[PDB]
Tab-separated table of C-alpha atoms and ligand atoms in Angstrom:
chain	number	residue	atom	x	y	z
A	1	UNK	CA	-17.058	4.308	-11.633
A	2	UNK	CA	-14.227	5.878	-9.612
A	3	UNK	CA	-10.625	4.612	-9.567
A	4	UNK	CA	-10.012	1.159	-11.032
A	5	UNK	CA	-8.294	-1.707	-9.221
A	6	UNK	CA	-7.127	-3.965	-12.024
A	7	UNK	CA	-5.786	-7.323	-10.866
A	8	UNK	CA	-3.862	-9.826	-12.974
A	9	UNK	CA	-4.440	-13.465	-12.048
A	10	UNK	CA	-1.840	-15.890	-13.422
A	11	UNK	CA	-2.951	-19.411	-14.218
A	12	UNK	CA	0.508	-20.880	-13.448
A	13	UNK	CA	0.113	-19.802	-9.805
A	14	UNK	CA	-1.927	-23.012	-9.458
A	15	UNK	CA	1.317	-25.056	-9.548
A	16	UNK	CA	3.098	-23.413	-6.590
A	17	UNK	CA	3.608	-25.346	-3.349
A	18	UNK	CA	2.619	-24.843	0.232
A	19	UNK	CA	2.153	-21.213	1.209
A	20	UNK	CA	2.575	-20.275	-2.444
A	21	UNK	CA	-0.331	-22.366	-3.739
A	22	UNK	CA	-3.025	-20.093	-5.163
A	23	UNK	CA	-6.440	-20.809	-6.653
A	24	UNK	CA	-9.200	-18.538	-8.037
A	25	UNK	CA	-11.223	-18.979	-4.818
A	26	UNK	CA	-8.409	-17.262	-2.893
A	27	UNK	CA	-9.446	-13.993	-4.556
A	28	UNK	CA	-12.001	-11.903	-2.650
A	29	UNK	CA	-14.812	-10.917	-5.086
A	30	UNK	CA	-14.767	-7.328	-3.790
A	31	UNK	CA	-10.976	-6.934	-3.834
A	32	UNK	CA	-10.639	-5.701	-7.430
A	33	UNK	CA	-12.849	-3.853	-9.927
A	34	UNK	CA	-11.322	-5.888	-12.782
A	35	UNK	CA	-9.599	-9.278	-12.895
A	36	UNK	CA	-7.465	-10.039	-15.947
A	37	UNK	CA	-6.755	-13.719	-16.632
A	38	UNK	CA	-3.146	-14.313	-17.734
A	39	UNK	CA	-3.164	-15.890	-20.192
A	40	UNK	CA	-5.137	-17.156	-23.140
A	41	UNK	CA	-3.127	-18.198	-26.162
A	42	UNK	CA	-3.059	-18.179	-29.948
A	43	UNK	CA	-3.385	-21.284	-32.114
A	44	UNK	CA	-3.699	-21.156	-35.925
A	45	UNK	CA	-4.237	-17.397	-35.750
A	46	UNK	CA	-7.178	-17.751	-33.363
A	47	UNK	CA	-7.817	-17.079	-29.677
A	48	UNK	CA	-7.354	-20.283	-27.756
A	49	UNK	CA	-6.669	-21.865	-24.373
A	50	UNK	CA	-3.299	-21.832	-22.742
A	51	UNK	CA	-3.791	-25.272	-21.197
A	52	UNK	CA	-6.677	-27.745	-21.159
A	53	UNK	CA	-7.332	-27.209	-17.421
A	54	UNK	CA	-8.350	-23.578	-18.058
A	55	UNK	CA	-11.343	-25.016	-19.898
A	56	UNK	CA	-14.363	-26.771	-18.475
A	57	UNK	CA	-14.860	-30.297	-19.799
A	58	UNK	CA	-16.341	-33.604	-18.591
A	59	UNK	CA	-17.924	-32.311	-15.382
A	60	UNK	CA	-14.640	-30.794	-14.215
A	61	UNK	CA	-14.792	-27.024	-13.717
A	62	UNK	CA	-11.842	-25.210	-15.348
A	63	UNK	CA	-9.940	-22.132	-14.125
A	64	UNK	CA	-11.841	-19.804	-16.485
A	65	UNK	CA	-15.169	-20.712	-14.806
A	66	UNK	CA	-13.721	-20.553	-11.295
A	67	UNK	CA	-12.396	-17.054	-11.928
A	68	UNK	CA	-15.654	-15.949	-13.530
A	69	UNK	CA	-17.675	-17.483	-10.670
A	70	UNK	CA	-16.407	-14.560	-8.588
A	71	UNK	CA	-18.944	-12.382	-10.451
A	72	UNK	CA	-21.769	-14.312	-8.752
A	73	UNK	CA	-20.763	-12.801	-5.391
A	74	UNK	CA	-19.848	-9.424	-6.933
A	75	UNK	CA	-21.936	-8.691	-10.048
A	76	UNK	CA	-20.103	-5.360	-10.582
A	77	UNK	CA	-16.815	-7.259	-11.074
A	78	UNK	CA	-15.445	-7.325	-14.660
A	79	UNK	CA	-13.159	-10.023	-16.073
A	80	UNK	CA	-10.920	-9.928	-19.128
A	81	UNK	CA	-8.744	-12.507	-20.853
A	82	UNK	CA	-5.174	-11.442	-21.579
A	83	UNK	CA	-3.317	-12.660	-24.664
A	84	UNK	CA	0.448	-12.428	-24.913
A	85	UNK	CA	2.985	-11.914	-22.179
A	86	UNK	CA	6.692	-12.704	-22.005
A	87	UNK	CA	6.513	-16.425	-22.939
A	88	UNK	CA	4.226	-15.770	-25.914
A	89	UNK	CA	6.905	-13.727	-27.669
A	90	UNK	CA	6.376	-11.530	-30.710
A	91	UNK	CA	6.306	-13.647	-33.844
A	92	UNK	CA	2.704	-14.860	-33.420
A	93	UNK	CA	1.574	-11.243	-32.944
A	94	UNK	CA	3.530	-10.093	-36.019
A	95	UNK	CA	1.829	-12.751	-38.122
A	96	UNK	CA	-1.615	-12.178	-36.701
A	97	UNK	CA	-1.402	-8.396	-37.145
A	98	UNK	CA	0.341	-8.346	-40.528
A	99	UNK	CA	-2.700	-8.489	-42.806
A	100	UNK	CA	-6.360	-7.593	-42.601
A	101	UNK	CA	-7.296	-11.230	-43.230
A	102	UNK	CA	-5.075	-12.416	-40.322
A	103	UNK	CA	-6.370	-9.694	-38.011
A	104	UNK	CA	-10.040	-10.377	-38.810
A	105	UNK	CA	-9.430	-14.095	-38.470
A	106	UNK	CA	-8.246	-13.457	-34.925
A	107	UNK	CA	-11.001	-10.923	-34.178
A	108	UNK	CA	-13.953	-13.061	-35.259
A	109	UNK	CA	-12.433	-15.936	-33.269
A	110	UNK	CA	-11.971	-13.743	-30.183
A	111	UNK	CA	-15.549	-12.540	-29.819
A	112	UNK	CA	-17.285	-15.930	-29.480
A	113	UNK	CA	-14.328	-17.290	-27.499
A	114	UNK	CA	-14.875	-14.546	-24.912
A	115	UNK	CA	-18.685	-14.573	-25.002
A	116	UNK	CA	-18.962	-18.369	-24.674
A	117	UNK	CA	-16.769	-18.234	-21.550
A	118	UNK	CA	-18.378	-15.222	-19.891
A	119	UNK	CA	-15.395	-12.883	-20.170
A	120	UNK	CA	-16.124	-9.151	-20.255
A	121	UNK	CA	-13.222	-8.187	-22.491
A	122	UNK	CA	-9.809	-8.757	-24.025
A	123	UNK	CA	-6.411	-7.506	-22.825
A	124	UNK	CA	-3.638	-7.319	-25.442
A	125	UNK	CA	-0.170	-8.014	-24.022
A	126	UNK	CA	2.189	-7.923	-27.000
A	127	UNK	CA	5.746	-7.575	-25.710
A	128	UNK	CA	6.541	-5.709	-27.834
A	129	UNK	CA	5.576	-4.304	-31.213
A	130	UNK	CA	8.850	-2.998	-32.626
A	131	UNK	CA	9.586	-1.114	-35.852
A	132	UNK	CA	7.405	0.773	-38.301
A	133	UNK	CA	5.456	-2.239	-39.540
A	134	UNK	CA	4.482	-3.410	-36.038
A	135	UNK	CA	3.686	0.157	-35.017
A	136	UNK	CA	1.123	0.514	-37.838
A	137	UNK	CA	-0.220	-3.025	-37.661
A	138	UNK	CA	-0.742	-2.826	-33.871
A	139	UNK	CA	-2.942	0.248	-34.297
A	140	UNK	CA	-4.798	-1.567	-37.104
A	141	UNK	CA	-5.369	-4.571	-34.816
A	142	UNK	CA	-6.713	-2.423	-31.960
A	143	UNK	CA	-8.826	-0.328	-34.328
A	144	UNK	CA	-10.478	-3.375	-35.883
A	145	UNK	CA	-10.911	-5.116	-32.535
A	146	UNK	CA	-12.620	-2.023	-31.131
A	147	UNK	CA	-14.961	-1.514	-34.078
A	148	UNK	CA	-15.895	-5.228	-34.125
A	149	UNK	CA	-16.579	-5.122	-30.385
A	150	UNK	CA	-18.771	-2.027	-30.939
A	151	UNK	CA	-20.745	-3.763	-33.743
A	152	UNK	CA	-21.259	-6.956	-31.752
A	153	UNK	CA	-22.551	-5.037	-28.714
A	154	UNK	CA	-25.233	-3.396	-30.862
A	155	UNK	CA	-26.290	-6.658	-32.528
A	156	UNK	CA	-26.544	-8.774	-29.361
A	157	UNK	CA	-27.703	-5.921	-27.095
A	158	UNK	CA	-25.240	-6.634	-24.278
A	159	UNK	CA	-22.642	-4.312	-22.775
A	160	UNK	CA	-19.679	-4.072	-25.116
A	161	UNK	CA	-16.597	-6.212	-24.621
A	162	UNK	CA	-13.754	-4.162	-23.160
A	163	UNK	CA	-10.466	-3.754	-25.024
A	164	UNK	CA	-7.349	-3.028	-23.013
A	165	UNK	CA	-3.610	-3.471	-23.300
A	166	UNK	CA	-0.547	-3.828	-21.098
A	167	UNK	CA	2.104	-1.387	-22.283
A	168	UNK	CA	5.811	-0.752	-21.503
A	169	UNK	CA	7.591	1.950	-19.532
A	170	UNK	CA	10.899	1.950	-21.423
A	171	UNK	CA	11.130	5.071	-23.606
A	172	UNK	CA	12.832	3.200	-26.474
A	173	UNK	CA	10.141	0.486	-26.418
A	174	UNK	CA	7.401	3.110	-26.395
A	175	UNK	CA	8.860	5.131	-29.256
A	176	UNK	CA	9.583	2.073	-31.412
A	177	UNK	CA	6.253	0.316	-31.131
A	178	UNK	CA	3.504	2.657	-30.014
A	179	UNK	CA	1.483	5.202	-31.924
A	180	UNK	CA	0.247	6.448	-28.560
A	181	UNK	CA	-2.595	8.765	-29.628
A	182	UNK	CA	-4.248	6.107	-31.822
A	183	UNK	CA	-3.556	3.287	-29.386
A	184	UNK	CA	-5.086	5.303	-26.532
A	185	UNK	CA	-8.152	6.140	-28.625
A	186	UNK	CA	-9.079	2.559	-29.446
A	187	UNK	CA	-8.467	1.137	-25.943
A	188	UNK	CA	-10.906	1.387	-23.063
A	189	UNK	CA	-7.951	1.672	-20.735
A	190	UNK	CA	-4.218	1.210	-20.594
A	191	UNK	CA	-2.405	-1.060	-18.163
A	192	UNK	CA	0.937	0.622	-17.663
A	193	UNK	CA	3.549	-1.971	-16.707
A	194	UNK	CA	5.224	0.265	-14.131
A	195	UNK	CA	7.675	-2.363	-12.872
A	196	UNK	CA	10.776	-4.272	-14.069
A	197	UNK	CA	12.564	-0.917	-14.272
A	198	UNK	CA	15.739	-2.649	-13.029
A	199	UNK	CA	16.820	-6.241	-12.482
A	200	UNK	CA	19.551	-8.852	-12.780
A	201	UNK	CA	20.124	-7.963	-16.441
A	202	UNK	CA	22.090	-4.977	-15.035
A	203	UNK	CA	25.483	-5.003	-13.275
A	204	UNK	CA	24.418	-2.841	-10.316
A	205	UNK	CA	21.442	-2.861	-7.945
A	206	UNK	CA	18.331	-0.948	-8.968
A	207	UNK	CA	14.742	-0.929	-7.769
A	208	UNK	CA	12.018	-2.930	-9.548
A	209	UNK	CA	9.632	0.027	-9.395
A	210	UNK	CA	10.987	3.340	-8.080
A	211	UNK	CA	8.466	6.183	-8.021
A	212	UNK	CA	11.314	8.624	-8.654
A	213	UNK	CA	14.842	7.834	-9.891
A	214	UNK	CA	17.674	8.112	-7.371
A	215	UNK	CA	20.066	11.038	-7.710
A	216	UNK	CA	22.964	8.616	-8.381
A	217	UNK	CA	21.231	7.811	-11.723
A	218	UNK	CA	22.748	8.889	-15.058
A	219	UNK	CA	20.170	11.182	-16.644
A	220	UNK	CA	19.447	8.402	-19.159
A	221	UNK	CA	18.775	6.136	-16.187
A	222	UNK	CA	16.497	8.796	-14.632
A	223	UNK	CA	13.937	8.078	-17.289
A	224	UNK	CA	13.470	4.784	-15.513
A	225	UNK	CA	10.831	5.610	-12.903
A	226	UNK	CA	7.078	5.222	-12.433
A	227	UNK	CA	6.680	8.995	-12.368
A	228	UNK	CA	8.631	9.584	-15.570
A	229	UNK	CA	6.931	6.723	-17.451
A	230	UNK	CA	3.339	7.660	-16.595
A	231	UNK	CA	3.987	11.283	-17.584
A	232	UNK	CA	5.678	10.191	-20.789
A	233	UNK	CA	2.495	8.362	-21.870
A	234	UNK	CA	0.480	11.549	-21.124
A	235	UNK	CA	2.962	13.680	-23.076
A	236	UNK	CA	2.560	11.285	-25.999
A	237	UNK	CA	-1.204	11.655	-25.990
A	238	UNK	CA	-2.702	9.120	-23.599
A	239	UNK	CA	-5.624	10.502	-21.536
A	240	UNK	CA	-4.687	10.578	-17.838
A	241	UNK	CA	-7.859	8.795	-16.833
A	242	UNK	CA	-7.137	5.890	-19.207
A	243	UNK	CA	-3.786	5.225	-17.537
A	244	UNK	CA	-3.965	2.483	-14.929
A	245	UNK	CA	-0.586	2.389	-13.193
A	246	UNK	CA	0.944	-1.028	-12.544
A	247	UNK	CA	1.930	-2.065	-9.014
A	248	UNK	CA	4.181	-5.117	-8.391
A	249	UNK	CA	3.486	-7.574	-5.587
A	250	UNK	CA	7.020	-8.788	-6.203
A	251	UNK	CA	10.548	-7.493	-6.080
A	252	UNK	CA	13.698	-7.938	-8.121
A	253	UNK	CA	16.850	-9.329	-6.549
A	254	UNK	CA	20.612	-9.065	-6.838
A	255	UNK	CA	23.647	-10.707	-5.290
A	256	UNK	CA	25.900	-7.905	-4.057
A	257	UNK	CA	29.511	-8.098	-5.235
A	258	UNK	CA	30.390	-6.862	-1.715
A	259	UNK	CA	27.892	-7.153	1.162
A	260	UNK	CA	29.255	-3.914	2.674
A	261	UNK	CA	28.229	-1.958	-0.434
A	262	UNK	CA	24.450	-2.421	-0.273
A	263	UNK	CA	22.840	0.870	-1.292
A	264	UNK	CA	20.952	1.347	-4.577
A	265	UNK	CA	23.356	1.442	-7.559
A	266	UNK	CA	25.872	-0.866	-5.822
A	267	UNK	CA	27.897	-3.387	-7.888
A	268	UNK	CA	26.143	-6.733	-8.275
A	269	UNK	CA	27.520	-10.076	-9.469
A	270	UNK	CA	24.144	-11.284	-10.721
A	271	UNK	CA	20.607	-12.063	-9.622
A	272	UNK	CA	19.596	-12.935	-6.084
A	273	UNK	CA	19.031	-16.556	-5.115
A	274	UNK	CA	15.664	-18.038	-6.091
A	275	UNK	CA	12.751	-18.090	-3.686
A	276	UNK	CA	11.326	-21.364	-2.431
A	277	UNK	CA	7.928	-20.747	-3.995
A	278	UNK	CA	8.563	-18.733	-7.144
A	279	UNK	CA	11.808	-20.617	-7.858
A	280	UNK	CA	13.377	-18.011	-10.140
A	281	UNK	CA	16.707	-16.232	-9.698
A	282	UNK	CA	16.294	-12.449	-9.762
A	283	UNK	CA	12.723	-12.513	-8.563
A	284	UNK	CA	10.722	-12.846	-5.344
A	285	UNK	CA	7.034	-12.632	-4.472
A	286	UNK	CA	6.075	-10.054	-1.826
A	287	UNK	CA	5.373	-12.852	0.664
A	288	UNK	CA	8.852	-14.286	0.041
A	289	UNK	CA	10.316	-10.838	0.812
A	290	UNK	CA	8.259	-10.869	4.028
A	291	UNK	CA	9.892	-14.123	5.164
A	292	UNK	CA	13.298	-12.525	4.681
A	293	UNK	CA	12.338	-9.447	6.736
A	294	UNK	CA	10.980	-11.662	9.482
A	295	UNK	CA	14.131	-13.769	9.588
A	296	UNK	CA	16.981	-11.316	10.029
A	297	UNK	CA	16.825	-9.211	6.876
A	298	UNK	CA	17.530	-5.476	7.075
A	299	UNK	CA	14.944	-2.959	5.790
A	300	UNK	CA	15.921	0.320	4.099
A	301	UNK	CA	13.511	3.078	3.077
A	302	UNK	CA	14.846	5.157	0.183
A	303	UNK	CA	13.273	8.593	0.549
A	304	UNK	CA	14.437	9.656	-2.900
A	305	UNK	CA	12.766	6.749	-4.723
A	306	UNK	CA	9.967	6.437	-2.162
A	307	UNK	CA	10.385	2.659	-2.134
A	308	UNK	CA	12.087	0.146	0.170
A	309	UNK	CA	14.738	-2.453	-0.340
A	310	UNK	CA	15.841	-5.336	1.854
A	311	UNK	CA	19.311	-6.752	2.475
A	312	UNK	CA	20.318	-10.086	3.973
A	313	UNK	CA	24.006	-10.858	3.684
A	314	UNK	CA	24.892	-10.309	0.040
A	315	UNK	CA	21.223	-10.672	-0.960
A	316	UNK	CA	19.496	-7.448	-2.086
A	317	UNK	CA	15.802	-7.061	-2.991
A	318	UNK	CA	13.969	-3.968	-4.276
A	319	UNK	CA	10.258	-4.373	-3.594
A	320	UNK	CA	7.042	-2.569	-2.701
A	321	UNK	CA	5.515	-2.563	0.763
A	322	UNK	CA	2.371	-1.077	2.312
A	323	UNK	CA	4.189	2.227	2.731
A	324	UNK	CA	5.449	2.572	-0.846
A	325	UNK	CA	2.115	1.345	-2.226
A	326	UNK	CA	0.052	3.879	-0.226
A	327	UNK	CA	2.382	6.674	-1.329
A	328	UNK	CA	1.975	5.561	-4.959
A	329	UNK	CA	-1.809	5.611	-4.483
A	330	UNK	CA	-1.577	9.228	-3.318
A	331	UNK	CA	0.534	9.995	-6.390
A	332	UNK	CA	-2.121	8.304	-8.558
A	333	UNK	CA	-4.766	10.618	-7.114
A	334	UNK	CA	-2.547	13.720	-7.184
A	335	UNK	CA	-1.905	13.126	-10.888
A	336	UNK	CA	-5.476	12.060	-11.760
A	337	UNK	CA	-4.582	8.718	-13.332
A	338	UNK	CA	-7.327	6.128	-13.804
A	339	UNK	CA	-6.393	3.723	-11.027
A	340	UNK	CA	-3.993	0.949	-10.089
A	341	UNK	CA	-3.153	-2.294	-11.849
A	342	UNK	CA	-1.612	-5.204	-9.952
A	343	UNK	CA	0.939	-7.773	-11.064
A	344	UNK	CA	-0.150	-10.048	-9.439
A	345	UNK	CA	-3.083	-10.921	-7.191
A	346	UNK	CA	-1.321	-14.230	-6.398
A	347	UNK	CA	1.913	-12.770	-4.943
A	348	UNK	CA	0.352	-10.418	-2.364
A	349	UNK	CA	0.078	-11.955	1.134
A	350	UNK	CA	-3.277	-13.445	0.102
A	351	UNK	CA	-3.617	-15.866	3.038
A	352	UNK	CA	-2.831	-13.023	5.450
A	353	UNK	CA	-0.563	-15.446	7.295
A	354	UNK	CA	2.934	-14.662	6.058
A	355	UNK	CA	3.811	-10.980	6.616
A	356	UNK	CA	2.729	-10.694	10.238
A	357	UNK	CA	-0.070	-8.138	10.200
A	358	UNK	CA	-2.718	-10.842	9.850
A	359	UNK	CA	-4.366	-9.052	6.932
A	360	UNK	CA	-5.394	-10.891	3.782
A	361	UNK	CA	-4.060	-8.934	0.792
A	362	UNK	CA	-2.160	-6.171	2.614
A	363	UNK	CA	-0.820	-4.532	-0.546
A	364	UNK	CA	-3.894	-4.714	-2.781
A	365	UNK	CA	-6.091	-4.078	0.263
A	366	UNK	CA	-4.110	-0.849	0.760
A	367	UNK	CA	-4.694	0.106	-2.884
A	368	UNK	CA	-8.438	-0.343	-2.535
A	369	UNK	CA	-8.437	1.595	0.732
A	370	UNK	CA	-6.583	4.601	-0.622
A	371	UNK	CA	-8.387	4.695	-3.988
A	372	UNK	CA	-11.897	3.492	-3.240
A	373	UNK	CA	-12.155	4.246	0.487
A	374	UNK	CA	-12.836	0.672	1.555
A	375	UNK	CA	-11.326	-0.417	4.881
A	376	UNK	CA	-9.183	-3.559	5.054
A	377	UNK	CA	-10.966	-4.439	8.289
A	378	UNK	CA	-11.261	-3.756	12.019
A	379	UNK	CA	-7.636	-3.834	13.240
A	380	UNK	CA	-5.814	-3.911	9.898
A	381	UNK	CA	-2.467	-2.201	10.522
A	382	UNK	CA	0.465	-1.782	8.115
A	383	UNK	CA	3.542	-3.754	9.071
A	384	UNK	CA	6.098	-1.192	10.212
A	385	UNK	CA	9.192	-2.825	8.746
A	386	UNK	CA	11.549	-0.162	10.116
A	387	UNK	CA	10.693	-1.475	13.597
A	388	UNK	CA	10.111	-5.160	12.811
A	389	UNK	CA	13.225	-5.797	10.755
A	390	UNK	CA	16.898	-5.030	11.307
A	391	UNK	CA	18.524	-1.801	10.155
A	392	UNK	CA	21.830	-0.929	8.483
B	401	LIG	C1	0.529	-8.549	-18.518
B	401	LIG	C2	1.915	-8.659	-19.035
B	401	LIG	O1	2.189	-8.352	-20.202
B	401	LIG	N1	2.648	-9.503	-18.305
B	401	LIG	C3	4.078	-9.652	-18.063
B	401	LIG	C4	4.446	-11.126	-17.703
B	401	LIG	O2	4.670	-11.922	-18.871
B	401	LIG	C5	5.666	-11.224	-16.781
B	401	LIG	O3	5.764	-12.498	-16.105
B	401	LIG	C6	6.248	-13.832	-16.580
B	401	LIG	O4	5.172	-14.215	-17.535
B	401	LIG	C7	5.417	-15.403	-18.309
B	401	LIG	C8	4.299	-15.518	-19.334
B	401	LIG	O5	4.186	-14.294	-20.016
B	401	LIG	C9	5.570	-16.626	-17.379
B	401	LIG	O6	5.728	-17.876	-18.084
B	401	LIG	C10	5.123	-19.071	-17.444
B	401	LIG	O7	5.988	-19.277	-16.083
B	401	LIG	C11	5.646	-20.404	-15.222
B	401	LIG	C12	6.821	-20.693	-14.323
B	401	LIG	O8	7.372	-19.485	-13.817
B	401	LIG	C13	5.246	-21.676	-15.984
B	401	LIG	O9	4.737	-22.693	-15.123
B	401	LIG	C14	4.186	-21.324	-17.005
B	401	LIG	O10	3.579	-22.453	-17.610
B	401	LIG	C15	4.849	-20.525	-18.080
B	401	LIG	N2	4.130	-20.778	-19.336
B	401	LIG	C16	4.591	-21.048	-20.568
B	401	LIG	C17	3.646	-21.800	-21.460
B	401	LIG	O11	5.548	-20.438	-21.034
B	401	LIG	C18	6.749	-16.332	-16.456
B	401	LIG	O12	7.019	-17.347	-15.506
B	401	LIG	C19	6.548	-15.047	-15.625
B	401	LIG	N3	7.527	-14.969	-14.493
B	401	LIG	C20	8.222	-13.907	-14.001
B	401	LIG	C21	9.226	-14.260	-12.859
B	401	LIG	O13	7.990	-12.765	-14.316
B	401	LIG	C22	5.622	-10.120	-15.724
B	401	LIG	C23	6.890	-10.026	-14.882
B	401	LIG	O14	7.825	-9.136	-15.458
B	401	LIG	O15	5.475	-8.856	-16.360
B	401	LIG	C24	4.239	-8.758	-16.844
B	401	LIG	O16	3.693	-7.502	-17.037
B	402	LIG	C1	21.581	-8.817	-23.352
B	402	LIG	C2	20.933	-8.100	-22.205
B	402	LIG	O1	20.823	-8.615	-21.092
B	402	LIG	N1	20.483	-6.867	-22.464
B	402	LIG	C3	19.834	-6.029	-21.467
B	402	LIG	C4	18.406	-5.696	-21.889
B	402	LIG	O2	17.633	-6.891	-21.883
B	402	LIG	C5	17.811	-4.670	-20.932
B	402	LIG	O3	16.426	-4.439	-21.177
B	402	LIG	C6	15.759	-5.134	-20.089
B	402	LIG	O4	15.782	-6.509	-20.447
B	402	LIG	C7	15.346	-7.354	-19.379
B	402	LIG	C8	15.604	-8.772	-19.826
B	402	LIG	O5	16.892	-8.888	-20.416
B	402	LIG	C9	13.881	-7.068	-19.070
B	402	LIG	O6	13.503	-7.844	-17.940
B	402	LIG	C10	12.519	-8.811	-18.328
B	402	LIG	O7	11.243	-8.222	-18.185
B	402	LIG	C11	10.181	-9.084	-18.608
B	402	LIG	C12	8.927	-8.243	-18.652
B	402	LIG	O8	9.245	-6.869	-18.835
B	402	LIG	C13	10.114	-10.245	-17.633
B	402	LIG	O9	9.007	-11.080	-17.950
B	402	LIG	C14	11.425	-11.017	-17.712
B	402	LIG	O10	11.420	-12.089	-16.775
B	402	LIG	C15	12.617	-10.087	-17.452
B	402	LIG	N2	13.868	-10.782	-17.718
B	402	LIG	C16	14.740	-11.170	-16.777
B	402	LIG	C17	15.978	-11.854	-17.273
B	402	LIG	O11	14.542	-10.977	-15.582
B	402	LIG	C18	13.673	-5.592	-18.757
B	402	LIG	O12	12.279	-5.327	-18.646
B	402	LIG	C19	14.302	-4.694	-19.830
B	402	LIG	N3	14.252	-3.291	-19.430
B	402	LIG	C20	13.129	-2.564	-19.330
B	402	LIG	C21	13.307	-1.137	-18.907
B	402	LIG	O13	12.016	-3.034	-19.570
B	402	LIG	C22	18.583	-3.358	-21.036
B	402	LIG	C23	18.848	-2.710	-19.693
B	402	LIG	O14	19.684	-1.566	-19.813
B	402	LIG	O15	19.856	-3.576	-21.676
B	402	LIG	C24	20.635	-4.744	-21.225
B	402	LIG	O16	21.072	-4.667	-19.905
């Protein structure tokens, strides 16, 4: 019991190079209370493997087993398999949820799939149900999943499979797709995706995950904050304790139209240049942001949003650091939410070698410290970026 620390592990992190290369054994068994494996997949309406190397076959241990092997060292650890995500899209969910036969086909495939692979539950990551049909059918899917999980638990006499979901922070997305009271009822807990609030799809800089909106925000734009989103879900009927608030170990990047105009809400010409390890314009891992800050980048703390951003030339990144993460943990406690969720475990400074404080998992370690009272170790000190990096 207590606050949850819910960590997403992404199976594509296995393909990154050099400092970016991540494997299940890089996760400390005691780091998180839950590890969610992103992702499984759907084939012919049934739960299936994303890639053959997630599976164990021919004496070669797959990623599923290597993640679940962490429970040998920490038997309290729970694992779940996520289905969906951005790549997965919506059409396969629409089809699977559209009829009782399609739903039950999925459900009775999901239970043995999970049990045979020693997963403790299923995380539904449909992005996103949209429109009245999806809104109803999503509730029906969760409802039938939950009652089938309940029936199985009683028949096999094992603890029940968990059912969770990752849900959006955009008010339009929420209203269109989510019957919040029913959704909240059928889920064990709710992974609030409190990030991607702003990014290269907009023509001005904005933070990936501001706790509060800046005052320069239009009052439409003010809805886009962690604080507003979490409270919206409560207002709509989600129990506070079921809300696990997402925390990004990444930032979103912009190229400034003019390097002299570098504050939040400054004109941008597009996304920031790709990182060496994550190789995607508009995006950087926390440890890629660290390299910037240790190589001439300027650090700004925004005391309105309670988050930092970094500038280097015309490159702008809104990210979370040990300071913003600790402050969000205090806000989690002050508001009695259920804990913190992390996207992802593989973009923290997991080696402890990149950000300079010589602490493995500085961000997630900070989450666990603040929420569960577990020290990150003897001389584990937050990097003070205001001193380490340049200023504006
Ligand atoms: C839990 C939740 O709903 N997750 C959201 C994530 O989907 C999202 O991250 C992106 O996820 C997609 C899959 O959903 C990634 O696609 C894969 O990307 C790598 C290369 O980057 C590739 O090697 C994989 O094979 C590929 N798979 C296939 C089969 O498509 C995508 O890269 C992710 N990348 C980024 C930069 O986000 C995150 C981020 O917003 O939000 C989650 O909540
Ligand atoms: C045509 C156009 O660009 N329209 C914009 C809308 O898309 C935008 O909504 C935001 O869309 C972007 C993508 O266009 C979302 O970012 C994506 O987030 C997913 C996970 O949430 C991530 O896996 C993707 O990688 C990422 N895409 C990119 C390109 O980085 C973003 O989450 C949407 N907004 C919110 C609040 O969730 C809105 C913005 O006003 O309208 C147009 O600008």
